[PDB]
Design a protein around this ligand. Sequence first.
Ligand code: 3CO
Ligand code: 3CO
Lengths: 248, 248
Amino acid sequence: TWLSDFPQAWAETGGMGLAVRQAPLIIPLKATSTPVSIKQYPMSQEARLGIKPHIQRLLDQGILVPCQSPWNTPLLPVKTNDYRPVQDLREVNKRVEDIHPTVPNPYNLLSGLPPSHQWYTVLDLKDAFFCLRLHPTSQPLFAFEWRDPSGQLTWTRLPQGFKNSPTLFDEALHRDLADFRIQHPDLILLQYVDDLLLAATSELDCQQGTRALLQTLGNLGYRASAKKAQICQKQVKYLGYLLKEGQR
Amino acid sequence: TWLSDFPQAWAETGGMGLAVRQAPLIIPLKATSTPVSIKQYPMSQEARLGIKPHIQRLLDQGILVPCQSPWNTPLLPVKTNDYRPVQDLREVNKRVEDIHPTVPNPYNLLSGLPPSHQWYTVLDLKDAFFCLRLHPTSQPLFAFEWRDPSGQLTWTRLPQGFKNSPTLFDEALHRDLADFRIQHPDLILLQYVDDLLLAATSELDCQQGTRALLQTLGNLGYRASAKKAQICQKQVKYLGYLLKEGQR
DNA sequence: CTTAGTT
DNA sequence: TAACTAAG
DNA sequence: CTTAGTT
DNA sequence: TAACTAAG
Ligand SMILES: [Co+3]
Ligand SMILES: [Co+3]
């Protein structure tokens, strides 16, 4: 009943997330930056047809909305022999002011894992970035032209490929789990963007903790993949390392 | 009468030099080195004809002599639209043990020039290397095949292109002028392989010094170019620098 | 002649 | 990874 | 589509 | 100074 007991925590049975606690972000520009409008490349009818179902959803979910901006970047058809929209935000990235990296690199992250905690739970957050709202004055930065034969659509949430997206989500989630960290000082919580690791002393403290977290997460607005989940094992796969009794 | 007063000091009127004080050198090998015999490349009759007059002289002067060695390197025709023998000692160089560089680089050499000494004399030594005898056990290293349609000829003096030749001549001449340096402490003598610089306080001390040196050199066995000579000036050309009142 | 070393 | 030079 | 960066 | 890749 791991799934039944926490409906709002899993993407499979929680719909879509929304970090309600987090104010919509602004994307500060470089003092030199001016809009760039890149024309849309043509696109096979098949490609454009495989991309419509995504543009349709995110439009109903209010993640995409129409707009009218001087910023415009191209959209892409990419093949898993299926299609999925991919925006080319490289020219926008060049113009966005950089932020200080806070995401610790995986090695130093795992350093702070006491060997005493041998009961692991691993969760990846589903559509992590969309959980973070964009402030309207920043939304025009990622507009893109769309048409199924027109005009511009942009994002209302932190988008795929925005160079600062992983750092910003990290700062957001660390903020939002600050409480949890305090409510459960016997547990060890590891944070790398969207991938989490919870380690405990006993299989008791692990399950009880995995519930406290899965509840904390659903309420706060994020969603985890019930598929790729790994609940209360002594052996889990976190950020490419294998964890078997404290090794790797 | 600069020329008349010192016949044995100038190559023009002193024939050929011979550092009589210096024992014939040995060329120590690398512990790994074994002879290499490189076959002679063909050679236009014109080239070979322009090279015969040199091979003829150095044979009469006893600088070249016949021999029979496992070492053999190629001889070269080079164009000044005239010919002059040039040996390719590169493969022998690879096999000769290196020696510690003692030749100071020109910058640091000129550093020790007191501005008080503004009266210069500059001399280049003619056929410097041939003034140094080779020990017979080392001579076979630079053999080369010669024929005016055969067999090997080698050198009895330090040869053109031997990688250690300039350092060895420097050590030799510094040795041989150690006395002079002491006999004339008011003069400044500068040594770079074959190019010398003598600087003095007065034009008196310069001329008197240039005589003491030109005599010291002739007796010891070296010869200077009376052509390219520069005697008692306040402005001379030494190792590419211009010396005008202590500048450069 | 070959070749050590160069955007 | 495409010759080109100066030097023996 | 483009393009940052690689013996 | 000859493309070739992965990534947006
Ligand atoms: Co160059
Ligand atoms: Co690679």
